[PDB]
Amino acid sequence: PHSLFSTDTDLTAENLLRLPAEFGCPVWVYDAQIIRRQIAALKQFDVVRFAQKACSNIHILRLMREQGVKVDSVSLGEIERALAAGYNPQTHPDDIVFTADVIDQATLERVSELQIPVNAGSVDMLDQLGQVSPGHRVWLRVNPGFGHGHSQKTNTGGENSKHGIWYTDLPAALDVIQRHHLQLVGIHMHIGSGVDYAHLEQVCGAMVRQVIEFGQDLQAISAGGGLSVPYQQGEEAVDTEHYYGLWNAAREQIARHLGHPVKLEIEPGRFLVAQSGVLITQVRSVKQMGSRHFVLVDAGFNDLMRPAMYGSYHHISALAADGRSLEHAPTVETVVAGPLCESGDVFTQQEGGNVETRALPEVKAGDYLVLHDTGAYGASMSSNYNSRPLLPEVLFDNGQARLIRRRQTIEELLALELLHH
């Protein structure tokens, strides 16, 4: 991640310390220019379609749209978010694509009404759509028979994945397409390769194979998402030119087979927004538990789910309350944990739950911690566990911080239950 004393971005030490006083704490902060930088790295692609489930604030969606980035919505709620951000299906039919493995009644009505292209990930879903919206423009999400990672575990592909039409179910999908006169716009895969370029090549190769074998005309293909970001010091960052080389080559083979140009979409979620965001949280309690040195803050896993749920790594920095530099202060092996009355609420833990320590300056109550690289799957995954309200979100742009989401209140949550007082 970025050092707080780099000062190329707006995510610096003086900048971060003042934010909690102005906007409240804990608080999510994003740097608009870092997002613009990630968008520019994918300029070779015809279409960059942001996977909004990674970070859905409508002001961040508006920023995407301003940069010519389109959007993928995976729920009816995400469709409404896109519309609130100025995406318009009537003037621009491909600006929003609705993508999922299932579709419910309200969504069917909404995508029929607005003629939002649907990327169906089950033949059943394709049939349900077709019956109520004959001739709808569709994409097919294909499961090519393999995913990424352990073959036994939940996956984005392969037989232990709920995602997409199994490749040998394609003929059955074509029957559904023909029955309802569906218009095939494109074929999509979302598997994710990180910086495993050999794995990426297998995805590209399966796309070429499957599209050519399916034998239908289409206007576009999508590489899906899954570009990784280096959460830990020294890890390798994605080479977008390399991604483009491999996916362009697959697109070109398909286009050659079809006899006309085929548009190439890429659908990043994490890559665009992860590094742009931080989470600022105050230290509230510091104590020794046996041989462990614990530092408890006011943000918990209901806020940032990753570490507690998956053992994910987020870099952690410390900010002294009075602003003195802790740059070169001595470090102590620290266990960082939250305020929830819940055993799993520990930020420094490995996959599977083992507690671990992080080398941090010796902070006191009143000091702040910064969790780095929380722009993706941070606020987007938040819950209200322990009756804790969604946090405020702040957007930095050229040194200026502005509120883009206010703190939810307990009253707003209670209004759901107070049905006539």
Ligand X SMILES: *Cc1c(COP(=O)(O)O)cnc(C)c1O
The residues, any chain, with a CB within 8 Å of residue 375's CB and separated by 6 or more, are 30, 34, 35, 54, 55, 273, 274, 275, 276, 277, 278
Residue numbers 88-147 binding Li ion by CB under 5 A: 147
- Tell me: is residue 310 an annotated ligand-binding position: yes
Q: Does 414 bind a copy of itself (CB under 8 A)?
A: yes
Name the phi and psi angles at 199, rounded to 5: -65, -40
Of the candidates 27, 29, 34, 54, which one interacts with ligand X according to CB under 6 A? 54
Of the candidates 346, 360, 363, 371, which one interacts with a copy of itself according to CB under 8 A? 346
Residue numbers 302-341 binding ligand X by CB under 6 A: 341
232 binds, among ligand X, a copy of itself, Li ion, none (CB under 5 to 8 A by kind): none
Q: Using CB atoms within 10 Å of the CB of residue 5, give its burial: 0 to 12 exposed, 13 to 18 middle, 19+ buried.
A: exposed
Of the candidates 43, 237, 292, 399, which one interacts with a copy of itself according to CB under 8 A? 292
269 within 8 A of 50, measured Cβ to Cβ: yes
307 within 8 A of 349, measured Cβ to Cβ: yes
Residue numbers 138-157 binding a copy of itself by CB under 8 A: 143, 145, 147, 150, 152-156
- Tell me: is residue 306 an annotated ligand-binding position: yes
For a copy of itself, give the closer residue by CB, 37 or 59: 59
Of the candidates 35, 97, 187, 227, which one interacts with ligand X according to CB under 6 A? 227
The rounded distance, in Å, linking the Cα atoms of 11 and 370 is 10
Q: Does 226 bind ligand X (CB under 6 A)?
A: yes
Q: Is residue 341 among the annotated active site residues?
A: yes
Helix (H, G, I), strand (E, B) or coil at 36: helix
The rounded distance, in Å, linking the Cα atoms of 224 and 267 is 5
- Tell me: is residue 36 an annotated ligand-binding position: no
65 binds, among Li ion, ligand X, a copy of itself, none (CB under 5 to 8 A by kind): none
Q: Does 350 bind Li ion (CB under 5 A)?
A: no
Closest CA to 116 of 84, 81, 89, 86: 89
Q: Does 210 bind ligand X (CB under 6 A)?
A: no
Q: Does 372 bind ligand X (CB under 6 A)?
A: no
The rounded distance, in Å, linking the Cα atoms of 151 and 49 is 28
For a copy of itself, give the closer residue by CB, 1 or 307: 307
The residues, any chain, with a CB within 8 Å of residue 332's CB and separated by 6 or more, are 293, 359, 360, 361, 362
Only one of the segments 232-240, 241-249, 264-272, 360-368 lies at the binding site for ligand X (rule: CB under 6 A); that segment is 264-272
Stretch 175-194: interaction string toward a copy of itself, x if CB under 8 A: ---------------x----
Helix (H, G, I), strand (E, B) or coil at 138: strand
Q: Does 256 bind a copy of itself (CB under 8 A)?
A: no
- Tell me: is residue 190 an annotated ligand-binding position: yes
The residues, any chain, with a CB within 8 Å of residue 367's CB and separated by 6 or more, are 282, 283, 318, 319, 320, 321
How many other C-beta atoms are found inside a 10 Å radius of the C-beta of residue 9?
18
For ligand X, give the closer residue by CB, 20 or 186: 186
- Residues annotated as binding site? 190, 226, 267-270, 306, 310, 342, 377
- Residues annotated as binding site for substrate? 190, 270, 306, 310, 342, 377
Binding footprint of Li ion on the chain (CB under 5 A)? 147, 151, 155, 158, 160, 302, 382, 384, 388, 390
